[PDB]
């Protein structure tokens, strides 16, 4: 269903000088981690439609030139270990950017693993920082987080005249 | 002495909702945020940088509203946001050079 319109050579020629270097093949590694079925003491509802998000991002990132890694229904501990393993991969030394997408239930500042346990987002970003991930120093790192940050529903407000 | 780097820089993080709030997911179309993200990135990665594309995503999310009659989510809203430590434009340059 998705189609990525290519950039023109003139566009590259007039915009590469003020942008991050982004021309490697692959453009970078991308990781899509989706948790949809939860089974811990802390009960969390099955995320119907999560399958659509997962396939949509895998496709999108592939079309954008990334080597896509996928992980599904992982515990908090498994997420931490495998995200650290992903950040530590040698392939980052020869790519120009990185993409990590996390899709699950969550609370402010943290996401749930399928065991109903939390992984703090600060620890996740730290795995990719300049101190812990030298291979990605100065390279653009994108993160997309589809997860709740609390349980308050926004009722919205009417536009005022 | 050689310039050093701050501990964390050059990251951009897009969130489907704001602190304290729930993010919305449609059972057939998937999450509002991911749906918008894919729509905008696929059509605009060719001529718009990532932070600007996330602004277009914000515009789509701000206008969307919940469909779930008889539940607490009917006509609900959500607002996505992004935070950035990027230090220059982030163009993905899809298709350049050709394949």
């Amino acid at each position: 269903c998705l189609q990525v319109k290519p950039c023109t050579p003139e566009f590259y020629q007039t915009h590469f000088q003020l942008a991050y270097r982004l021309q490697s093949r692959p453009r970078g590694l991308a990781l899509v981690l989706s948790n949809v079925h939860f089974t811990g003491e802390k009960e969390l509802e099955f995320r119907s439609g999560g399958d659509v998000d997962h396939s949509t991002l895998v496709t999108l990132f592939k079309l954008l030139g990334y080597d896509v890694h996928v992980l599904c229904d992982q515990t908090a501990q498994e997420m931490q270990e495998k995200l650290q393993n992903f950040a530590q991969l040698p392939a980052h030394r020869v790519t120009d950017s990185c993409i990590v997408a996390l899709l699950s239930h969550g609370v402010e500042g943290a996401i749930y693993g399928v065991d109903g346990k939390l992984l703090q987002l600060q620890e996740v970003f730290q795995l990719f920082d300049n101190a812990n991930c030298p291979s990605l120093q100065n390279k653009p790192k994108m993160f997309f987080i589809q997860a709740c940050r609390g349980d308050e529903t926004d009722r919205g407000v009417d536009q005022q005249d | 002495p050689k310039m050093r780097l701050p501990t964390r820089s050059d990251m951009i993080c897009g969130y489907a909702c704001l602190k304290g709030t729930a993010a919305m997911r449609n059972t057939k179309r998937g999450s509002w945020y991911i749906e918008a993200l894919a729509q905008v990135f696929s059509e605009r990665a060719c001529d718009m940088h990532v932070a600007d594309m996330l602004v277009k995503v914000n515009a789509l999310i701000k206008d969307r509203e919940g469909y779930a009659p008889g539940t607490e989510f009917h006509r609900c809203k959500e607002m996505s946001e992004y935070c950035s430590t990027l230090c220059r434009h982030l163009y993905l340059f899809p298709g350049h050079p050709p394949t």
């Binding site: 119907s48 699950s104 239930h105 709740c148 529903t153 | 993010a23 919940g66 989510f73 609900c76």
Partner: peptide
């Protein structure tokens, strides 16, 4: 229908 994450 729309559900919360």
């Amino acid at each position: 229908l729309d559900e919360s994450x």
